[PDB]
Design a protein around this motif. Structure first.
Motif, PDB file in Angstrom:
ATOM      1  N   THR B   1      -4.316   7.498   6.543  1.00 14.30           N
ATOM      2  CA  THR B   1      -4.642   8.894   7.643  1.00 14.30           C
ATOM      3  C   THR B   1      -3.022   8.910   8.344  1.00 14.30           C
ATOM      4  OG1 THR B   1      -4.244   6.667   8.982  1.00 14.30           O
ATOM      5  CG2 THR B   1      -6.243   7.853   8.554  1.00 14.30           C
ATOM      6  N   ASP B   2      -2.916   9.963   9.123  1.00 11.79           N
ATOM      7  CA  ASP B   2      -1.980  10.656   9.403  1.00 11.79           C
ATOM      8  C   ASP B   2      -1.049   9.218  10.207  1.00 11.79           C
ATOM      9  OD1 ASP B   2      -3.336  10.029  11.508  1.00 11.79           O
ATOM     10  OD2 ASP B   2      -3.106  13.406  12.408  1.00 11.79           O
ATOM     11  N   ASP B   3      -1.288   7.522  10.173  1.00 15.98           N
ATOM     12  CA  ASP B   3      -0.341   6.612  10.682  1.00 15.98           C
ATOM     13  C   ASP B   3      -0.598   5.600  10.159  1.00 15.98           C
ATOM     14  OD1 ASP B   3       1.226   5.613  12.060  1.00 15.98           O
ATOM     15  OD2 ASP B   3      -0.099   5.326  14.224  1.00 15.98           O
ATOM     16  N   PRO B   4      -0.084   5.495   9.286  1.00 13.52           N
ATOM     17  CA  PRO B   4       0.301   4.762   8.017  1.00 13.52           C
ATOM     18  C   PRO B   4       0.905   3.811   9.254  1.00 13.52           C
ATOM     19  CG  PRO B   4       1.540   6.280   6.446  1.00 13.52           C
ATOM     20  CD  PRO B   4       0.969   6.823   8.145  1.00 13.52           C
ATOM     21  N   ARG B   5      -0.463   1.867   8.684  1.00  9.05           N
ATOM     22  CA  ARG B   5       0.855   0.359   9.532  1.00  9.05           C
ATOM     23  C   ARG B   5       0.402  -0.181   8.352  1.00  9.05           C
ATOM     24  NH1 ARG B   5      -2.175   1.202  15.394  1.00  9.05           N
ATOM     25  NH2 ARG B   5      -0.799   2.688  16.166  1.00  9.05           N
ATOM     26  N   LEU B   6       1.006  -1.503   9.022  1.00  9.72           N
ATOM     27  CA  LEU B   6       1.353  -3.134   8.479  1.00  9.72           C
ATOM     28  C   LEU B   6       0.343  -2.767   7.290  1.00  9.72           C
ATOM     29  CD1 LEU B   6       2.561  -5.232  10.574  1.00  9.72           C
ATOM     30  CD2 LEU B   6       3.593  -4.242   8.772  1.00  9.72           C
ATOM     31  N   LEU B   7      -1.351  -2.538   7.486  1.00  6.37           N
ATOM     32  CA  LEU B   7      -1.754  -2.747   6.581  1.00  6.37           C
ATOM     33  C   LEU B   7      -1.946  -1.934   4.892  1.00  6.37           C
ATOM     34  CD1 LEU B   7      -5.114  -3.614   5.393  1.00  6.37           C
ATOM     35  CD2 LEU B   7      -5.971  -2.107   6.823  1.00  6.37           C
ATOM     36  N   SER B   8      -1.573  -0.931   5.366  1.00 11.33           N
ATOM     37  CA  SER B   8      -1.278   0.594   3.703  1.00 11.33           C
ATOM     38  C   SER B   8       0.406  -0.998   2.708  1.00 11.33           C
ATOM     39  CB  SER B   8      -0.375   1.428   4.541  1.00 11.33           C
ATOM     40  OG  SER B   8       0.776   1.245   5.648  1.00 11.33           O
ATOM     41  N   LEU B   9       1.013  -1.012   4.006  1.00 11.46           N
ATOM     42  CA  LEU B   9       1.577  -2.305   2.727  1.00 11.46           C
ATOM     43  C   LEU B   9       0.808  -3.218   1.559  1.00 11.46           C
ATOM     44  CD1 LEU B   9       5.312  -2.829   5.050  1.00 11.46           C
ATOM     45  CD2 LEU B   9       4.206  -0.359   3.736  1.00 11.46           C
ATOM     46  N   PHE B  10      -0.171  -3.957   1.657  1.00 12.09           N
ATOM     47  CA  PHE B  10      -0.475  -4.254   1.322  1.00 12.09           C
ATOM     48  C   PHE B  10      -1.152  -4.080  -0.317  1.00 12.09           C
ATOM     49  CE2 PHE B  10      -1.132  -8.341   3.663  1.00 12.09           C
ATOM     50  CZ  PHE B  10      -0.307  -7.804   4.633  1.00 12.09           C
ATOM     51  N   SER B  11      -0.262  -3.019  -0.863  1.00 11.48           N
ATOM     52  CA  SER B  11      -0.141  -2.663  -1.883  1.00 11.48           C
ATOM     53  C   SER B  11      -0.065  -3.354  -3.379  1.00 11.48           C
ATOM     54  CB  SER B  11      -0.054  -0.988  -2.514  1.00 11.48           C
ATOM     55  OG  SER B  11       1.531  -1.412  -2.630  1.00 11.48           O
ATOM     56  N   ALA B  12      -0.053  -4.693  -2.896  1.00 17.93           N
ATOM     57  CA  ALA B  12       0.217  -5.587  -4.723  1.00 17.93           C
ATOM     58  C   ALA B  12      -0.718  -5.897  -4.989  1.00 17.93           C
ATOM     59  CB  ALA B  12       1.176  -6.637  -3.908  1.00 17.93           C
ATOM     60  N   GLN B  13      -0.529  -5.280  -5.988  1.00 19.09           N
ATOM     61  CA  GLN B  13      -1.998  -6.121  -7.073  1.00 19.09           C
ATOM     62  C   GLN B  13      -2.028  -7.418  -7.203  1.00 19.09           C
ATOM     63  OE1 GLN B  13      -2.690  -2.231  -8.131  1.00 19.09           O
ATOM     64  NE2 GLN B  13      -0.490  -2.803  -8.999  1.00 19.09           N
ATOM     65  N   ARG B  14      -1.225  -8.431  -8.139  1.00 19.25           N
ATOM     66  CA  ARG B  14      -1.062  -9.115  -7.688  1.00 19.25           C
ATOM     67  C   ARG B  14       0.482  -9.601  -6.911  1.00 19.25           C
ATOM     68  NH1 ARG B  14       2.214  -8.580 -12.122  1.00 19.25           N
ATOM     69  NH2 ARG B  14       3.506  -9.836 -12.510  1.00 19.25           N
ATOM     70  N   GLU B  15       0.045 -10.999  -6.162  1.00 23.41           N
ATOM     71  CA  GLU B  15       1.226 -12.211  -5.491  1.00 23.41           C
ATOM     72  C   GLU B  15       2.397 -11.787  -6.253  1.00 23.41           C
ATOM     73  OE1 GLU B  15      -0.181 -15.803  -4.576  1.00 23.41           O
ATOM     74  OE2 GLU B  15       2.226 -16.387  -3.726  1.00 23.41           O
ATOM     75  N   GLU B  16       2.671 -12.012  -7.056  1.00 23.53           N
ATOM     76  CA  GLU B  16       3.753 -11.336  -8.326  1.00 23.53           C
ATOM     77  C   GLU B  16       4.137 -10.093  -8.136  1.00 23.53           C
ATOM     78  OE1 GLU B  16       1.931 -15.192  -9.195  1.00 23.53           O
ATOM     79  OE2 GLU B  16       1.437 -13.174  -9.298  1.00 23.53           O
ATOM     80  N   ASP B  17       4.005  -9.483  -7.629  1.00 24.29           N
ATOM     81  CA  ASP B  17       4.006  -8.186  -7.079  1.00 24.29           C
ATOM     82  C   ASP B  17       4.885  -7.957  -5.920  1.00 24.29           C
ATOM     83  OD1 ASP B  17       3.802  -7.569  -9.876  1.00 24.29           O
ATOM     84  OD2 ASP B  17       1.701  -6.983  -9.329  1.00 24.29           O
ATOM     85  N   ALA B  18       4.941  -8.955  -4.981  1.00 21.06           N
ATOM     86  CA  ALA B  18       4.809  -8.814  -3.688  1.00 21.06           C
ATOM     87  C   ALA B  18       5.656  -9.529  -3.010  1.00 21.06           C
ATOM     88  CB  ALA B  18       3.808  -9.344  -2.164  1.00 21.06           C
ATOM     89  N   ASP B  19       6.962  -8.105  -2.484  1.00 22.09           N
ATOM     90  CA  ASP B  19       8.261  -8.786  -1.362  1.00 22.09           C
ATOM     91  C   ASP B  19       8.069  -9.991  -0.667  1.00 22.09           C
ATOM     92  OD1 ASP B  19       9.564  -6.629  -2.561  1.00 22.09           O
ATOM     93  OD2 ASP B  19       7.996  -5.228  -1.943  1.00 22.09           O
ATOM     94  N   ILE B  20       6.559  -9.616   0.243  1.00 25.13           N
ATOM     95  CA  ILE B  20       6.467 -10.671   0.680  1.00 25.13           C
ATOM     96  C   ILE B  20       5.275 -11.180   1.096  1.00 25.13           C
ATOM     97  CG2 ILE B  20       5.954 -11.015   3.880  1.00 25.13           C
ATOM     98  CD1 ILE B  20       8.779  -8.893   3.996  1.00 25.13           C
ATOM     99  N   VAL B  21       5.067 -12.604   0.958  1.00 22.34           N
ATOM    100  CA  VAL B  21       3.806 -12.989   1.084  1.00 22.34           C
ATOM    101  C   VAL B  21       3.330 -14.344   2.425  1.00 22.34           C
ATOM    102  CG1 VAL B  21       2.169 -14.935  -0.975  1.00 22.34           C
ATOM    103  CG2 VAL B  21       4.122 -13.229  -1.469  1.00 22.34           C
TER     104      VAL B  21
END
Ligand SMILES: [Mn+2]
Ligand SMILES: [Mn+2]
Ligand SMILES: [Mn+2]
Ligand SMILES: [Mn+2]
Ligand SMILES: [Mn+2]
Ligand SMILES: [Mn+2]
Lengths: 289, 289, 289
Positions: B1-21
């Motif tokens: 949408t026109d206001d991306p929020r925290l939910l939008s940051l959960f783009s990591a395929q797998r946990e290992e790809d994440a900055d913050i778990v």
């Protein structure tokens, strides 16, 4: 245990051995009549509940150890009529004052302050000062401070209305107080000076033998929702604590009451604030010479 | 949408790809035992509800764009016994730390911080610092920070109790911390310095590899009512946000937990504050070199 | 009695005799669609309840006597469709403006501000300014201020978004306003300057014929819980009162609306704050030359 609290200070065998005597006045009458809610009569019970639980006797933040003080709970004033109740309250407070001990009265509605003031006037004839910490003036034609301003032996120059709110005070009410040489310290003025600084100024005016009367609806309802007449703006909890500590350490403050606690309105956060207020008074008192 | 929020940051395929778990710990144990209310076990669910809904990823007020960060929700720690649960939590946090990623643990009660600290001590042997943001000391003979102060490899000179309250801390408890060379930063002192300034001083003491442990009952209950042990006075929501942002941008902060969120006590305003706190940490983290 | 209040100012025989005309708009539409709660339609009734009860007409704290002002309640806008309702609201506000009187519109959701702005644009062709006091931007592709920014006769240089929050505003939304030459005054900036000082700056930008639009979810939920979308941080009640007084005394402010009051969320403290806000506007208005 490893964290002694207020409960631990109730070591007085008998009341006469206590520095501070707690007296309950479980009656609604006060701001309920000014549009407020019934339920202040439940204040003494709610206060007692948290009295059993709160307040480190040695406070390492303020560096005050209240270990040497002895507290006593004299219970509630009981009577078949409100009028008899007022009489018994006055008589009890007087006896505590007369032997040099400190009465703290937990209400219950504002109306308690009239009998409390009368005990003061009896104990220190013609030499009493009074501060009413209240968002309201409590002076309508009755209200407890109109009763005391009408006392022959009381000098209005030594009466302060503290943290009163212009949105809640009639011109006729302000006029009555000022015509009696009383002093209005509006919330905005208390805020500007700082609450403790302003209260120091107030005690300067009330002078010797001061009755410190604290209507808790003077606190903003964000911190203190559980009162008969909840305030939109007002004193913060910290300001109230800080004021109570000052009153505790000020040797001219000879009694305190606390009115309008209403657990029917809110029953957990507000009685805790009330106990913490008393707690700060106790710490301040601990530092009296 | 026109206001991306925290939910939008959960783009990591797998946990290992994440900055913050994100790791949930749905267990009550903590301040409930110190007179508090049951229900902190519901904190992770309530946090998740608002996690789905809040927090503009590009914040034009603070001028920080957190678009590049990847978040991952590893779910809740599950176990048939609290002891096994503690073990699994420690092990999980350690694995996240060991690969250089940032674990954020949403509770759940204070007791989670002991396993969390142990994961830290394992990951950075003899070189951990710890700050407990808490109105209480959490050091009673057990409490999570007594467990960590009793660790051979942990230097107490690098432990800070932050925003603790004198009305709520035993002399024996303060004594224990100070005898271990730990530091007490009382609420009044944090207020006097400014919350962010005081936290900077704290991070100066904790040094490298700091565990930022945030008990939300350190916030005043006017802003944060939904905790097991609601505070009469304490940190404001803004102070908490500002502190969380600082922790996010401070490269020495290697994990964070958040304890005592209790939706049984209050279920809408408080979990929002918790998510906004995490949100500010995420913005700060976005600015790390 | 001995304490005349706002109720006493409703002395206007007919609406035309009034300085300030109150109009109710009992419809939910606004922040409810942005995740908020239904119930704002109950705002006008709750506002009226306390309107009957609050606000000393002669305020001795601020030293302003509002005795000479005449208020009138024109009741609620009624219609079988929301679209007709918007039309009737616009038409009504316009007629009040056209004869030089001051319309105050109590909502009800944010959507009311679009018809209200249109009445302004009709009454002061090409010479309107608008301030939206709101934690949110209200500009999504519809939202009331996108509708007004799309008006040919409205200069965006005279639109201010006041006390907006970065955690709640999309980059695309900020971009839209700024591309229209509108001004963002973030909560942090309002706090830094002081709320009244910042609002003075805002009125400097809006200029003549200003619509003062006050979404009460701009207030922190500690003071103002009863709104469709409760704010974790925001304006205090005192800041809101102080702002309302300034707007009252500022001769370029030609109408006011108040949106998002939601008694289904909280029904006692919040409507009181709303009435006290209007009350301060009335005191300020009393001082207009
Ligand atoms: Mn009173
Ligand atoms: Mn009162
Ligand atoms: Mn804790
Ligand atoms: Mn705690
Ligand atoms: Mn809005
Ligand atoms: Mn809004």
């Amino acid at each position: 245990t490893d964290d002694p609290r207020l409960l631990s200070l109730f070591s007085a065998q008998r009341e006469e051995d206590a520095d501070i005597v707690i007296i309950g006045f479980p009656y609604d009458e006060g701001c309920v009549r000014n549009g407020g809610r019934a339920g202040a009569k439940k204040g003494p019970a709610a206060f007692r509940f948290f009295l059993q639980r709160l307040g480190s006797v040695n406070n390492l933040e303020l560096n005050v150890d209240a270990s040497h003080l002895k507290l006593y709970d004299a219970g509630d004033i009981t009577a078949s009529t409100l009028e008899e109740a007022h009489e018994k309250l006055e008589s009890k407070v007087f006896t505590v004052l007369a032997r040099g001990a400190f009465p703290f009265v937990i209400g219950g509605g504002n109306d308690q302050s009239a009998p409390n003031g009368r005990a003061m006037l009896r104990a220190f004839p013609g030499d009493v000062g009074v501060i009413n910490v209240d968002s309201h003036l409590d002076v309508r034609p009755g209200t407890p401070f109109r009763q005391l301003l009408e006392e022959s032996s009381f000098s209005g120059k030594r009466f302060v209305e503290f943290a009163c709110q212009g949105s809640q005070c009639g011109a006729l009410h302000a006029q009555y107080v000022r015509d009696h040489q009383g002093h209005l310290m509006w919330l905005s003025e208390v805020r500007k000076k700082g609450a403790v600084a302003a209260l120091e100024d107030a005690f300067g005016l009330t002078g010797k033998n001061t009755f410190f009367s604290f209507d808790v609806d003077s606190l903003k309802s964000s911190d203190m929702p559980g009162v008969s007449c909840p305030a939109a703006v007002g004193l913060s909890a910290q300001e109230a604590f800080d004021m109570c500590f000052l009153a505790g350490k000020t040797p001219t403050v000879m009694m305190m009451d606390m009115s309008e606690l209403n657990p029917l309105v809110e029953e957990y956060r507000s009685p805790r604030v009330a106990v913490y207020m008393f707690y700060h008074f106790v710490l301040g008192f601990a530092t009296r010479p």
